Design a protein around this ligand. Structure first.
Ligand SMILES: Nc1ncnc2c1ncn2[C@@H]1O[C@H](CO)[C@@H](O)[C@H]1OP(=O)(O)O
Ligand SMILES: Nc1ncnc2c1ncn2[C@@H]1O[C@H](CO)[C@@H](O)[C@H]1OP(=O)(O)O
Ligand SMILES: [Ca+2]
Ligand SMILES: [Ca+2]
Ligand SMILES: [Ca+2]
Ligand SMILES: [Ca+2]
Lengths: 260, 259
């Protein structure tokens, strides 16, 4: 809890630094993103020059994520929200050691709420412990899914069936916060066909602590080594969405996947 | 009158704290408590006021007579159940068929959106700036995934979803109307909504020069349910004239079926 404390503090400074630029003011968003990852990357290597960093903004492209201590960071998850709402965005940081998860952090800057988790030690929202997730049926569940996905060829019919059955659907525009929302019980499931390592790195650690699960749309495991599709939910309904709704269209999904 | 405004603005907050207490004193229970507390408070004080709300409260009222309170005691009941937040008390007031005040109270955030006709719109003490026009292309819109599933309506809404910068869905109409009032969404749509879903957010919205209609570009009134398109004027004009009005007749059909 020296690396942890240090990770914990940095994500929070990075946030306040963001608030500080915003108030000093879509070219804005492009700087800020850049300036924030550059701040995160510079502060890390100045103390831990052996630590590797995989960033949204380009740092560590094609790194071996399984060697040494590896920070995977997205300085702003929810750029559009950042630009149009000036809120509902987050910094995401997962720290892996030898390929194994150590810590996750996702910080809702404008709410000033930090979701944090060290592996084996439980999940937190601010300083309140998160409870382990209960099982639900899709029919009493609220699902996180973007309307844009429902317009697609193939993918659309598939998500249609599952939107129809869901109690109801939401779309917040930040994958890290929505993974977090699942970890908090606020969404029973979240799904999307494409996401990059930094978008789920921080949040999966958190989720693993309250026993939620993450797979891609084909039920296979997620790694920080490459991009993928995403299905996150409590144990019972993840099993339900994959077994019933996705996996009979396996071949249609392997194909879009092999394309994308 | 000012007493009327004061009393209403007071009452909605008051009912709000009661909901925090009932929860803390731990939704169907909470929702009855809220609807009885509001209605009884209105009426102990204004026996002549009319009240229109859920479960046939005020049904077949003549909404153009006297003072009508159009109340949804918890808007976003599902978010209440599953999230214990992002729900709202919404209260719209009309007088002689005409809007007067609108209140939407985000209870767990403790934020009162409020407005009185011709005197600007507020979020607590802060004035809301008027909206600027946006095109659809740089706009985020509120539309629930459910509505892109429907056979004919889906097709119509796909068009606008593909076009917009991105879409969102929050599970509260009153907050999503309000989110347009704030500039937080540029537009929000849905094929069905009750008068108590929109009555409050509509007053707040026209005080920042936002626009309301149904999907056919007709005025919304508090005399029936309806479809809804809300936005800044520029893009409510782009959406209506470019993506909905070309299918006026499909929409008239779907509308006739739905109601
Ligand atoms: N290729 C892409 N295009 C748009 N959003 C993407 C994306 N890949 C991942 N995302 C993520 O999906 C969510 C968009 O609702 C965000 O979490 C967004 O990250 P970003 O905000 O940093 O672009
Ligand atoms: N069947 C229906 N007809 C009209 N409005 C509905 C509806 N079902 C849900 N809504 C309302 O539309 C929004 C999205 O569901 C919510 O504000 C919700 O109000 P409620 O939460 O009080 O049920
Ligand atoms: Ca980003
Ligand atoms: Ca991202
Ligand atoms: Ca309600
Ligand atoms: Ca309602």
């Amino acid at each position: 809890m020296a690396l942890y404390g240090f990770a914990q503090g940095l994500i929070q400074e990075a946030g306040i630094r963001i608030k500080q630029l915003m108030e000093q003011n879509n070219d804005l968003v492009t700087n800020v993103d850049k300036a924030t990852e550059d701040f995160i990357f510079d502060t890390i290597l100045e103390t831990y020059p052996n630590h590797q960093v995989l960033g949204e903004e380009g740092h560590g492209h094609d790194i071996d994520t399984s060697k040494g201590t590896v920070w995977v960071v997205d300085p702003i998850d929810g750029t559009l929200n950042f630009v149009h709402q000036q809120e509902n965005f987050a910094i995401s940081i997962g720290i892996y050691i030898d390929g194994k998860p150590y810590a996750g952090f996702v910080y809702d800057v404008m709410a000033d709420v930090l979701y944090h988790a060290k592996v084996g030690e439980g999940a937190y929202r601010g300083s309140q412990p998160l409870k382990p997730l209960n099982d639900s049926n899709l029919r009493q569940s609220i699902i996180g899914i973007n309307p844009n996905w429902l317009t697609k060829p193939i993918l659309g019919e598939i998500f249609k069936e599952i939107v129809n059955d869901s109690r109801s659907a939401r779309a917040y525009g930040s994958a890290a916060l929505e993974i977090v929302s699942v970890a908090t019980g606020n969404l029973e499931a979240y799904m999307t066909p494409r996401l990059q390592p930094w978008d789920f790195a921080g949040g999966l650690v958190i989720l693993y602590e309250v026993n939620g699960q993450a797979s891609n749309l084909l039920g296979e495991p997620l790694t920080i080594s490459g991009p993928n599709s995403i299905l996150v939910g409590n144990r019972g309904l993840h099993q339900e969405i994959s077994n019933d709704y996705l996996e009979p269209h396996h071949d249609a999904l392997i194909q879009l996947h092999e394309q994308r």
